[PDB]
Amino acid sequence: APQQINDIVHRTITPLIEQQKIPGMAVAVIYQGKPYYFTWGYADIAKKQPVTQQTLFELGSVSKTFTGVLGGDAIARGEIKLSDPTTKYWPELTAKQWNGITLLHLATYTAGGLPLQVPDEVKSSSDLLRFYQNWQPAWAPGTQRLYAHSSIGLFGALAVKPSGLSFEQAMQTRVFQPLKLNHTWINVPPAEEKNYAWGYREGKAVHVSPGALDAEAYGVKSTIEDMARWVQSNLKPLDINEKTLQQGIQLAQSRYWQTGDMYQGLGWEMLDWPVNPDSINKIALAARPVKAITPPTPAVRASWVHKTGATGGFGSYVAFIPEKELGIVMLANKNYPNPARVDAAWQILNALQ
């Protein structure tokens, strides 16, 4: 690899691993359209399995970027519209608090305070309906943003209904396969378990537990190679041959709402570039008023586009700058502080800017 990339990556990630006591980590830097890979440590401490370019990590909420793009693809196909009422796709959701709540609100966490977590008790399709029917919004729709797995999770489930496919089948056929993400999974097959890293929490090896809307909100597992390919696809959507997918990627990077210096896309979050680290998980719940961008701004090339993701034992981060054809993916099997992720990513991309 070019020595500049080698050096900034190693000088930034080594101290990170030491300070955060990360057991294993993979990093991909996309520079001028080409990916460069780096790995450290262990995928499985007890079995002494090293992290390799083929190791599967739990992406956690970085999964929301796949959901946002799958939703965008469905919009492009004319299957759904973000302006459609949630009830158009779930007529059984008859409680009155849902009048006025659109798919856009679900996709962008602006429905009025849907909670971060779907309760553990919610398992069956009937349990889920009961949960949403009983939910009482704290606010009118489209007034405040409260990041939530239950909001974009529902968006993902509803967005694939017109297709007739399960969320997983839709994601495989419409996003994973076309982009050749052949080692990206919602459910890790037995044949691939040898590559599935263990996550570590309080020193214990752990994997994400099954949960309602998990696939849609935080359940994707992937390798550093596939994630580099995902970043490349999002950096240059016009190179994608599938028309509705190219469009869906573009829609996921449109700016729908603004809170402070941040703009909410579908899954992706964006800030104008240049940006310094302070503007870009220590807070369990952060309610913020949002300003609608009427109409949404199409994907801005000069943007820092990113998403953090976690599961109990994993910490992921993806950021890219379209205008510079520059990006980075940091996958780790410890859920370490988000600021440390952003500070390292910024240190690396700014140096290569």
The CATH number covering residue 202 comes to 3.40.710.10
Number of domains in the chain: 1
Contact 149, 170 (CB under 8 A): no
Phi, psi of 259 (to 5 degrees): -135, 110
Residues facing residue 288 across a β-bridge = 145
Q: List, in order, residues 6 or more apart from 134 with CB less than 8 Å away.
A: 95
Q: How many CB atoms lie within 10 A of CB 26?
A: 28
Q: How far apart are CA 319 and CA 27, in angstroms?
A: 12
- Which contiguous run of DSSP H or E holds residue 170? helix 167-171
Contact 57, 26 (CB under 8 A): yes
Q: How far apart are CA 170 and CA 213, in angstroms?
A: 15
Q: How many CB atoms lie within 10 A of CB 149?
A: 24
Q: Can you give the residue range of the structural domain that contains 187?
A: 1-353
**Long-range residue pairs from 187-192, CB within 8 A, at least 24 positions apart, any chain:** 188/56, 188/221, 192/56
Phi, psi of 249 (to 5 degrees): -60, -40
Q: How far apart are CA 56 and CA 24, in angstroms?
A: 11
By annotation, the residues acting in catalysis are 61
Q: List, in order, residues 6 or more apart from 221 with CB less than 8 Å away.
A: 56, 57, 58, 59, 184, 185, 186, 188, 196
Q: How was this structure determined?
A: X-ray
Radius of gyration in angstroms for the set of CA atoms belonging to the chain, rounded to a whole number: 19
Burial (CB count <10 Å: 0-12, 13-18, 19+), residue 143: middle
User: In this structure, what token pair is assigned to residue 175?
Assistant: 């996003």
Contact 302, 270 (CB under 8 A): no
Closest residue by Cα to residue 223 from 175, 172, 173, 184: 184
